[PDB]
Paper text:
BrlR mediates the antibiotic resistance of P. aeruginosa by activating the expression of multidrug efflux pumps and repressing PhoPQ activation. The monomer can be divided into three domains: the N-terminal DNA-binding domain (residues 1–75), which adopts a winged helix-turn-helix fold; the long central α-helical linker (residues 76–119), which connects two terminal domains; and the C-terminal multidrug-binding domain (residues 120–270). Our most striking finding is that BrlR is not only a pyocyanin receptor but it is also a dual receptor that is responsive to both c-di-GMP and pyocyanin.
Despite great effort, we were unable to obtain diffraction-quality crystals of the BrlR-pyocyanin complex. The newly identified binding site is unique among those of all GyrI-like structures determined to date. The ligand is stabilized chiefly by hydrophobic interactions with the surrounding residues in addition to an H-bond with E247 at the bottom. The residues lining the pyocyanin binding pocket are conserved in many GyrI-like proteins, suggesting that the GyrI-like domains in other bacteria may also recognize pyocyanin. Together, the BrlR-C domain contains two adjacent binding sites within the multidrug-binding pocket. Hence, the pyocyanin binding pocket of BrlR-C domain is quite rigid. It is unlikely that the larger drug molecules located in the canonical binding pocket can slide into the pyocyanin binding site and promote BrlR-DNA binding, as reflected by the EMSA results for tobramycin. Among these ligands, pyocyanin is the only one expected to affect the interface of the two terminal domains in BrlR, and only the binding of pyocyanin to the corresponding site will induce a significant conformational change in the HTH motif.
Numbering used by the authors:
A (entry chain A): 122 to 140, 142 to 270
B (entry chain B): 123 to 270
The structure:
Amino acid sequence: ARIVERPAFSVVGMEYFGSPGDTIGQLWERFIPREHEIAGKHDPEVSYGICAQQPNGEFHYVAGFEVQEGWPVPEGMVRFQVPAQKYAVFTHKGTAPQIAESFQAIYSHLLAERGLEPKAGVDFEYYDQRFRGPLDPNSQVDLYIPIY
Amino acid sequence: RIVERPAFSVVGMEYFGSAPGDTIGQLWERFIPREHEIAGKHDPEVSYGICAQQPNGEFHYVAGFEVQEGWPVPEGMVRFQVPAQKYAVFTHKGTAPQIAESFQAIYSHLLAERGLEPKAGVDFEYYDQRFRGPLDPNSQVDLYIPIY
Ligand SMILES: Nc1cc2nc3ccccc3nc2cc1O
Ligand SMILES: Nc1cc2nc3ccccc3nc2cc1O
């Protein structure tokens, strides 16, 4: 795992709430045809799966792009602020639905085995050109885990 | 909810992230018609989704039943030893695939918010009669998280 610090950054995209009928996979499927609408992209080759939490504890997910500030947020989309954090970066090898299994393995075992101490914040999936499709077993996705 | 349990034995079928295209959902689908084969069940109304770690580090999963010792393990099934542990028990409300989202929320935020420290071990999903089916949003499943 790689240790990285990043300043705060802005993400624009479409969101999913853990509390009816929707899924993260359905979120990405409806977002894909609309990704080109987002102006101000830092890097259109990179997308994010933001795993955040509402104050009430509800799981909150945003599929989006890092953007320079000051450009529009399209209809049906939202801006999300990722705060400045320090991260342990784990490379997940497998499908997009298997990301959930990697999160469980990381939090339940891999952090402690590496001596990395998690710090509650905003986690994210980092999709670059190593991501070949949601069901490709050879896809890679980096998982940024906030740490002390 | 804080629960201590002694060690117990679980018999059932395994999921490895290595079989391309296989999923935990398909594991349960192929396990369903064979559940009746397992002798020595503690309670056939309860099933377990064991989230464990292989020696090499991957996520490993067992769908199974708690059994008294000394009965056979059917062909294509395994015995899995759950060690004696202390657990924080969180009730997941939603579909079975959404369990993954609850695990991420619990480990990333909810444990720290409750003052609980995770203790790397064996996690499990606890399915009782509150579980209506894998894609029913009205289902409930208890998540047992090992802690100090
Ligand atoms: N029945 C299912 C249980 C699942 N549990 C998970 C636990 C951690 C990470 C991902 C998980 N995915 C599951 C999918 C299921 O259909
Ligand atoms: N592309 C996907 C990412 C997912 N990330 C998750 C992170 C934590 C818990 C469950 C998750 N499920 C995902 C499903 C996806 O299709």
